[PDB]
Amino acid sequence: EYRSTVNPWASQLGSLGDIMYNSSYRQTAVPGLYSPCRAFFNKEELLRN
Amino acid sequence: NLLLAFNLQNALKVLCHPRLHTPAHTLNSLNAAPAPRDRRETYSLQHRRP
């Protein structure tokens, strides 16, 4: 409760930790390869539940 | 078991309130006291203009 975040380069509405791993910015991405963070920043993964 | 950090920054939610910088309730509770002190002082209270 005493600080906002520890990583202000990966926890904003749009940032580095978002643009590498948002499907909303992975439009030009390949549909094949797996990444570890794709379940950590996909909004449709965290909000369908 | 997370290690939270209570510095002074959280205590500003209390210490920066005007209720801690008023003497008014303190003063009238001293005025409603049944016993004031017997050993009074008079030396450097108020400045007399010469």
Side-chain angles (χ1 to χ4, degrees):
Chain A
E1 308 308 282
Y2 86 112
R3 59 183 171 178
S4 320
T5 171
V6 203
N7 185 335
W9 285 319
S11 78
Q12 307 294 320
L13 70 169
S15 297
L16 187 144
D18 214 332
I19 58 169
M20 304 161 73
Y21 311 113
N22 211 313
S23 305
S24 316
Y25 310 129
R26 279 168 65 100
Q27 313 291 334
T28 178
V30 310
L33 269 302
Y34 176 75
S35 174
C37 324
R38 212 206 163 181
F40 264 129
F41 301 101
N42 214 341
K43 197 136 173 202
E44 310 167 59
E45 187 73 64
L46 51 88
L47 257 175
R48 70 165 79 161
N49 307 113
Chain B
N1 318 85
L2 208 59
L3 193 60
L4 277 61
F6 193 90
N7 57 356
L8 202 76
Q9 169 60 226
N10 254 314
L12 318 171
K13 275 214 171 56
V14 167
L15 289 177
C16 317
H17 195 267
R19 281 275 290 197
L20 292 185
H21 312 318
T22 173
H25 309 279
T26 289
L27 260 295
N28 48 66
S29 41
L30 275 169
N31 290 9
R37 202 185 55 185
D38 195 278
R39 199 250 319 161
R40 268 86 194 260
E41 80 294 336
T42 40
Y43 158 68
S44 179
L45 263 66
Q46 52 105 31
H47 166 269
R48 276 173 187 150
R49 300 169 177 174

